[PDB]
Design a protein around this ligand. Structure first.
Ligand code: CL
Ligand code: CL
Ligand code: NI
Length: 261
């Protein structure tokens, strides 16, 4: 034998894996209960930088999942922390929501649209033309260019909606530049960070999610086990079509839980 017994830390997708819309999925609670009993650990991760980790902590709590503050990580905190680590406190032009802006400021970065050294692109649900224009002008001056994550679209109640990667396509068409760094899944940085933060070797970690391409690729890139659940973006028919398969497939977190009980 039982290979999954060795996993000490599970990185979990949120919407589509732990809950769907505003409702918890079958076995989600059971799964956390099991982890607690077995002295194992989890952390939620999302590429979705339109909100901060605390907004998602709040969302979970409001569904009756009591989690500590450090239970969620997003591409926003990964990006802000990586910049802080490698470059110190940075002057940035940010294409991001007010929530993402607080994330960068919490890491001691400063928004300076006049004299930035970085252009930083997130899931900017507050994008305007003028802001796109300014970003392009700066990119043409050769500013260092960072995106929180690559995703072209984001799943939604209304179907696939443009995400950071769609904005990237506009920027690239206008300036000819792609980001110098894209921090989020499937960049293995995410895993390295979490691994160092909680002191767990990659060999005792797994990625559990519903994003066939991204989550599997994160596992390959990072060298950790990928477990796909069937509750979200991925169907059995998608799995059959997939060029690269996950390490394990489970109906949902409740069935995964039974695998490790
Ligand atoms: Cl066996
Ligand atoms: Cl056996
Ligand atoms: Ni057996």
């Amino acid at each position: 034998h039982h290979v999954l017994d060795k996993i000490e830390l599970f990185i979990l997708d949120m919407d589509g894996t732990f809950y769907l819309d505003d409702s918890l999925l079958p076995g989600s609670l059971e799964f956390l209960e099991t982890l607690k009993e077995k002295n194992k650990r989890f952390v939620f991760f999302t590429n979705n930088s339109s909100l901060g980790a605390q907004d998602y902590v709040r969302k979970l709590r409001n569904m009756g999942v009591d989690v500590p503050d450090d239970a969620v990580v997003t591409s926003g905190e990964i990006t802000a922390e990586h910049m802080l680590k490698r470059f110190g406190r940075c002057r940035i032009f940010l294409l991001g929501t007010p929530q993402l802006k607080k994330v960068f400021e919490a890491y001691g970065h400063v928004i300076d649209e006049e004299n930035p050294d970085f252009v930083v692109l997130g899931f900017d649900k507050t994008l305007t033309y003028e802001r796109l224009k300014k970003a392009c002008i700066l990119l043409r001056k050769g500013k260092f260019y960072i995106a929180t994550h690559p995703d072209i679209n984001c799943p939604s109640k209304e179907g696939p909606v443009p995400d950071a990667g769609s904005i990237m396509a506009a920027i690239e068409a206008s300036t000819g530049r792609k980001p110098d760094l894209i921090a989020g899944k499937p960049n293995p940085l995410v895993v390295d960070v979490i691994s160092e933060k909680f002191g767990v070797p990659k060999e005792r970690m797994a990625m559990v999610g519903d994003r066939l391409y991204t989550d599997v690729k994160l596992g390959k890139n990072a060298g950790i086990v990928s477990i796909l659940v069937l509750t979200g973006e991925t169907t059995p028919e998608d799995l059959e079509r997939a060029e690269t398969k996950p390490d394990f497939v489970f109906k949902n977190l409740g069935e995964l839980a039974k695998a490790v009980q």
